[PDB]
Amino acid sequence: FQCTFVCCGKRFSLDFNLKTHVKIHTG
Ligand SMILES: [Zn+2]
């Protein structure tokens, strides 16, 4: 998918990698 939080704005590939990442912006 894609990130859009803070200055991280990283890149997401799929749902698994989607939450496995944004999980921080969420905690
Ligand atoms: Zn991010």
Q: How far is CA 10 from the centre of its chain?
A: 6
Q: Decide: residue 6, CB within 10 A, 0-12 exposed, 13-18 middle, 19+ buried.
A: exposed
CA distance 10 to 25: 11
The count of domains in the chain is 1
Selection from 14, 11, 8 nearest residue 26 by Cα:
8
Cβ neighbors of 3 (< 8 A, separation 6 or more) are 9, 10, 11, 12, 21, 22, 25
- Tell me whether residue 7 is annotated as binding: no
- What is the CA(4)–ligand 1 centre distance, in A? 6
Cα(19) to ligand 1 centroid in Å equals: 10
Cβ-contact 6, 25 below 8 angstroms: yes
CA 23 remoteness from chain centre:
7
Q: How was this structure determined?
A: NMR
Alpha helices in 1-27 (DSSP H): 15-26
Q: Residue 1 sits in which domain range?
A: 1-27
